[PDB]
Amino acid sequence: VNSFSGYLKLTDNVYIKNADIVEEAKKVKPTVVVNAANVYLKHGGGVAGALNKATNNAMQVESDDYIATNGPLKVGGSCVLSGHNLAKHCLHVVGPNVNKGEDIQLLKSAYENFNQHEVLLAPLLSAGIFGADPIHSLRVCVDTVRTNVYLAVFDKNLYDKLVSSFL
């Protein structure tokens, strides 16, 4: 049993809810929250900007030190950093950004990072301002992630469409 409430079950291991991932993290304090990161860990907008704002910029301060030491992530890659006030850990995962012309086949590689964690709270990757089709992102998630993932989708309108189109 876990703390996640109000989710629709899509598969054995994937659950979905219309929720603000920031407000969901604040309530649950999950072991892992996933950030929709870029390779520079520059948390300006989208899910990353919202998570970082909720940490009072501490996420960005920590991220800048990580990049100064290690250099940029790979598209499809990830790193584990603090979850600050939101979670124990934040898994920063880089999905391909269609608005930068990145290979959408890298979305499966991105979701494979989730398999290193038994339970996660996560946004659909590459969706929103990353320009991928969220329906596609949910299909790759279900077909890739084998650990237990709780998806918090921001838009009530994109949410209802994801449920009603899910195969």
Ligand X SMILES: O=C(O)c1cc2c(Cl)cccc2[nH]1
Residues that bind ligand X (CB under 6 A): 36, 46-47, 123-124, 127-130, 153-154
- C-alpha to C-alpha distance for 91 and 111, rounded to whole angstroms: 11
- Is the Cβ of residue 83 or residue 123 nearer to ligand X in the bound state? 123
Q: Per the structure block, which two tokens stand in for 90?
A: 């934040």
Q: How far is the CB of 127 from ligand X (least distance, A)?
A: 4
**CA geometry: angle at 21 spanning 17 and 25, to 5°?**
110
Quote the least distance from Cβ 88 to ligand X, whole Å. Answer: 21
Kindly tell me which of 30 and 123 has the beta carbon lying closer to ligand X. Answer: 123
- Measured from the CB of residue 143, what is the shortest distance to ligand X in angstroms? 17
Q: What span, in angstroms and rounded, lies between the C-alpha atoms of 25 and 4?
A: 10
Decide whether 34 or 81 has the Cβ nearer to ligand X.
34
Rounded to 5°, angle at Cα 55 from 59 and 141: 70
Which residue has the CB atom at the shortest distance from ligand X?
Answer: 128
Please state the closest distance from residue 1 (CB atom) to ligand X, in A.
25
Cβ-based nearer residue to ligand X, 69 or 99 = 99
User: What is the C-alpha separation between 81 and 107, in angstroms, rounded?
Assistant: 21
Angle at 77 between CA 76 and CA 81, to 5 degrees: 140
